[PDB]
Amino acid sequence: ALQTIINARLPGEEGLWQIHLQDGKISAIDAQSGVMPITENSLDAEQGLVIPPFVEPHIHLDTTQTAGQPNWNQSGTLFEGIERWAERKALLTHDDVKQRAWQTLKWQIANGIQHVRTHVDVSDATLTALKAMLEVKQEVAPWIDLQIVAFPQEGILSYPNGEALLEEALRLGADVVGAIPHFEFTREYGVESLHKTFALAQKYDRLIDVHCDEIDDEQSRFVETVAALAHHEGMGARVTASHTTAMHSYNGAYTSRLFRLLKMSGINFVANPLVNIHLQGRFDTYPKRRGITRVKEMLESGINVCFGHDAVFDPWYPLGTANMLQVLHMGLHVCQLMGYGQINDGLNLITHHSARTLNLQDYGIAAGNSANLIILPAENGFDALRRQVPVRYSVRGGKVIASTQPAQTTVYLEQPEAIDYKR
Amino acid sequence: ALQTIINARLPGEEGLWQIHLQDGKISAIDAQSGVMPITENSLDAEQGLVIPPFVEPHIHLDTTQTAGQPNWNQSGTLFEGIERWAERKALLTHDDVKQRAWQTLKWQIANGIQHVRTHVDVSDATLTALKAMLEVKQEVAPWIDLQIVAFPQEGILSYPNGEALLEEALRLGADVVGAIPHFEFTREYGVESLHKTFALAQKYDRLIDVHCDEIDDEQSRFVETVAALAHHEGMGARVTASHTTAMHSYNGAYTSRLFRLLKMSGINFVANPLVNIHLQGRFDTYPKRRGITRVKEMLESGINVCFGHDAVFDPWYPLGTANMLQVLHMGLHVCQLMGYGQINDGLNLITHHSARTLNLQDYGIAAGNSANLIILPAENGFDALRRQVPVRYSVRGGKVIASTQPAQTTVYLEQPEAIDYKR
Numbered sequence: 001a002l003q004t005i006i007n008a009r010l011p012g013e014e015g016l017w018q019i020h021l022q023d024g025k026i027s028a029i030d031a032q033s034g035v036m037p038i039t040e041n042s043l044d045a046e047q048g049l050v051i052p053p054f055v056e057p058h059i060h061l062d063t064t065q066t067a068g069q070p071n072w073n074q075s076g077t078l079f080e081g082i083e084r085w086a087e088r089k090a091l092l093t094h095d096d097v098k099q100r101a102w103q104t105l106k107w108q109i110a111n112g113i114q115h116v117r118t119h120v121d122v123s124d125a126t127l128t129a130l131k132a133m134l135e136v137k138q139e140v141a142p143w144i145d146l147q148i149v150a151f152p153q154e155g156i157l158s159y160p161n162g163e164a165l166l167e168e169a170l171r172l173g174a175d176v177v178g179a180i181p182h183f184e185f186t187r188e189y190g191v192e193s194l195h196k197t198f199a200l201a202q203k204y205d206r207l208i209d210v211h212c213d214e215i216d217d218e219q220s221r222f223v224e225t226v227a228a229l230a231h232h233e234g235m236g237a238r239v240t241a242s243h244t245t246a247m248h249s250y251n252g253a254y255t256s257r258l259f260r261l262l263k264m265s266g267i268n269f270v271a272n273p274l275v276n277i278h279l280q281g282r283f284d285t286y287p288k289r290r291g292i293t294r295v296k297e298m299l300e301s302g303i304n305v306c307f308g309h310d311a312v313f314d315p316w317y318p319l320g321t322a323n324m325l326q327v328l329h330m331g332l333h334v335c336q337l338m339g340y341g342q343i344n345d346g347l348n349l350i351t352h353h354s355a356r357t358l359n360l361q362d363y364g365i366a367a368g369n370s371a372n373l374i375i376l377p378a379e380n381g382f383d384a385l386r387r388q389v390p391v392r393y394s395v396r397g398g399k400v401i402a403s404t405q406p407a408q409t410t411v412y413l414e415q416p417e418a419i420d421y422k423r
Numbered sequence: 424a425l426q427t428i429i430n431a432r433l434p435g436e437e438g439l440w441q442i443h444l445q446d447g448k449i450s451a452i453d454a455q456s457g458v459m460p461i462t463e464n465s466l467d468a469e470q471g472l473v474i475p476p477f478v479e480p481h482i483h484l485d486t487t488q489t490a491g492q493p494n495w496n497q498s499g500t501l502f503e504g505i506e507r508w509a510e511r512k513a514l515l516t517h518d519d520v521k522q523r524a525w526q527t528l529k530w531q532i533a534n535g536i537q538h539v540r541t542h543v544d545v546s547d548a549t550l551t552a553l554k555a556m557l558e559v560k561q562e563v564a565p566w567i568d569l570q571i572v573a574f575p576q577e578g579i580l581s582y583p584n585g586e587a588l589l590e591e592a593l594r595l596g597a598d599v600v601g602a603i604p605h606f607e608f609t610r611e612y613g614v615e616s617l618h619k620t621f622a623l624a625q626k627y628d629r630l631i632d633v634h635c636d637e638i639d640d641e642q643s644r645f646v647e648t649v650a651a652l653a654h655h656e657g658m659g660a661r662v663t664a665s666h667t668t669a670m671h672s673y674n675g676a677y678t679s680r681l682f683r684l685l686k687m688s689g690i691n692f693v694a695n696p697l698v699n700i701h702l703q704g705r706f707d708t709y710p711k712r713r714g715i716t717r718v719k720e721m722l723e724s725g726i727n728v729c730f731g732h733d734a735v736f737d738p739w740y741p742l743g744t745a746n747m748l749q750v751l752h753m754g755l756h757v758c759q760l761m762g763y764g765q766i767n768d769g770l771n772l773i774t775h776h777s778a779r780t781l782n783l784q785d786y787g788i789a790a791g792n793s794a795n796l797i798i799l800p801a802e803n804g805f806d807a808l809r810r811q812v813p814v815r816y817s818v819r820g821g822k823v824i825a826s827t828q829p830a831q832t833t834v835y836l837e838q839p840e841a842i843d844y845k846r
């Protein structure tokens with residue numbers, strides 16, 4: 001029955017703070033002028049950093065843990081990945097999807113992630129994975145608020161009954177409408193697919209998250225239609241453009257023109273560093289492009305951008321432990337957001353910016369909000385990122401739902417010495 | 424009460440000529456076999472060059488003289504320019520627009536310009552600048568025939584009530600319908616905006632002048648729609664594509680295909696050398712492209728192309744004295760039209776070709792035409808351009824409306840010597 005979080009550091013704030021908890025919510029936040037004593041019912045942050053929970057804005061829980069089944073993606077490309085997934089999709093069973101999704105979700109809970117948006121392939125007349133995921137959503141609710149995107153992986157207009165299946169998925173309860181314009185057979189189908197996606201989102205009052213321009217094609221500009229339709233409907237807050245890796249290859253003049261619309265539209269952007277560095281640049285010899293969208297410029301322009309893990313051991317990515325600080329680490333390097341302040345503020349890319357992408361209404365350390373927060377054994381964002389620290393405690397509804405007793409490293413010199421990699 | 428212009432040289436003609444004037448018109452033109460004596464009622468061209476008036480086919484009189492108000496365009500780009508202008512547009516007043524427009528118009532009269540096409544931003548519900556410019560048009564009529572383009576600077580489909588405001592501007596009397604497809608939110612809005620522009624021009628029997636592809640984007644090809652719609656409606660003579668700077672970046676194969684249509688369509692092209700060299704190439708590091716449309720190739724293909732000043736001390740250009748020979752000088756250098764004949768024929772780019780762009784019906788030194796002409800103290804186009812000569816006399820309706828007493832330079836060597844920079 002926790003009543004207070006004491007000795008907490010907060011990003012962008014000086015000193016220590018006390019967070020009072022009442023009835024599963026944050027009742028008040030007060031600055032401390034020194035270190036407070038521990039006591040029963042008090043969770044001691046020990047001058048560590050307290051932040052709202054990590055968020056996973058983009059993952060594929062229906063494909064997670066399937067890498068190599070029945071075959072491996074040899075080329076390491078998005079296109080072969082979809083082909084390898086199609087082979088696995090034909091072998092799906094309800095229980096298998098639930099088991100694999102739950103395996104990755106447990107890693108996420110352990111990693112302080114309390115909000116997850118999973119795409120689920122609905123280019124499947126049986127909607128096997130979707131039915132399984134809707135059950136997982138209910139089962140995992142005490143620990144993670146899971147959003148499900150009805151993702152038409154093989155296209156809306158380019159797959160048999162694609163539009164009907166996408167709508168069926170919404171009627172079954174999917175929270176977000178997906179699309180993949182660059183995978184449609186033609187540019188015209190791509191644009192038309194977006195009009196259909198927006199019409200469905202307005203008909204059912206759902207969010208939108210488009211796999212948008214995930215291709216090293218300087219002519220893949222579906223993002224301008226996503227932003228324009230959102231602006232026209234006055235619904236930018238409910239819309240997300242995932243990937244936009246083609247933007248890495250656009251000329252600068254078009255990008256500058258486009259940025260005005262991106263800002264005016266208010267839509268969100270998701271970059272997936274671990275997967276993008278792996279799948280993009282595969283058609284270059286040397287030099288080889290990085291292939292991540294224009295994260296640095298978006299931040300400078302005040303456009304909301306955040307980071308997702310995208311895949312965890314599946315056709316598009318052979319690694320991962322569903323760790324957001326690891327995703328952030330890769331993104332900061334590839335996007336060259338390596339200034340001290342840029343690294344320190346990096347936490348926003350896996351917390352607040354992602355919460356905005358998911359249109360969350362109860363997020364942040366503020367009075368009145370649910371007591372959902374995590375404690376990192378680090379002094380600030382820079383320190384947490386540099387040392388790739390685990391989540392010491394994850395609190396949800398005012399209760400501890402995960403904890404990590406840190407590793408203990410000792411070197412035996414003339415005398416034993418504890419090493420914590422700090423300075 | 425001038426009755427004759429004597430000792431006149433004419434471009435492309437040998438010898439001297441006499442131009443007889445009667446009732447404000449040119450009654451006859453006769454060759455001379457020698458130098459004629461001066462006499463009362465005779466304006467002596469003194470073997471200088473006589474040409475129809477200079478023309479300014481593209482200028483923004485509503486923004487002229489506002490550079491730095493309230494802020495400067497730091498990046499030197501078209502996009503920031505529009506943003507800086509938006510800030511100034513919110514501060515417009517009727518009298519301020521009239522005063523600034525008249526300041527630049529007086530410089531134009533002094534520079535022998537008797538025909539001017541000004542764009543006026545109509546992405547403004549108050550249409551403040553347009554109302555002011557319609558009054559200026561009437562006031563300046565004795566000296567300059569001013570055409571007003573209803574220019575939807577912030578887009579037709581991408582600005583609130585953009586189409587209604589564009590039509591309102593035509594109902595108030597604007598002479599030309601404008602558009603800016605590359606600034607619309609999407610390629611589809613760009614193309615649609617052109618269909619709407621042409622429909623308005625046919626509904627009101629007005630000319631068209633599109634700010635077309637003014638961007639270093641090799642995919643900005645709105646010019647093909649402008650030309651195709653003009654060809655379909657059989658109205659090329661009434662249509663102009665301004666800038667087309669993207670053409671500088673097109674691959675050669677597409678450009679060759681496009682050129683057939685450009686020629687067949689009969690539309691006009693305006694290049695704005697002083698502004699284009701400044702605003703284009705801003706997204707390149709090194710090498711840096713010039714960014715002017717394909718003027719040399721247009722001339723070789725018989726496509727009508729001409730030069731405008733575009734801006735005089737405003738968001739898009741911090742310099743200028745509204746001097747067409749200076750605009751021509753820049754264009755010849757950047758477009759590499761540096762052969763003797765190319766330079767000598769350069770005057771066509773600021774006289775006859777521009778008159779065609781404005782669809783002028785009374786222009787040129789020919790019997791029956793109004794006696795509107797200017798006298799340059801130079802032997803030919805090459806000489807006028809090299810020495811950047813002023814306009815000795817500007818005649819309109821058979822009367823002198825401007826004159827420049829040339830500067831007198833002397834060097835004091837062993838004896839004083841007059842220097843005129845001639846050879």
Ligand SMILES: O=C1NC=C(F)[C@H](O)N1
Nearest residue numbers: 060180211214310311316
């Ligand atoms: O279309 C896609 N499917 C799965 C992925 F992991 C990648 O995000 N893109």
Ligand SMILES: O=C1NC=C(F)[C@H](O)N1
Nearest residue numbers: 483603634637733734739
């Ligand atoms: O769109 C534009 N507005 C103003 C200029 F000077 C430039 O011609 N382009």
Ligand SMILES: [Fe+3]
Nearest residue numbers: 060119211310
């Ligand atoms: Fe994905």
Ligand SMILES: [Fe+3]
Nearest residue numbers: 483542634733
């Ligand atoms: Fe212009």
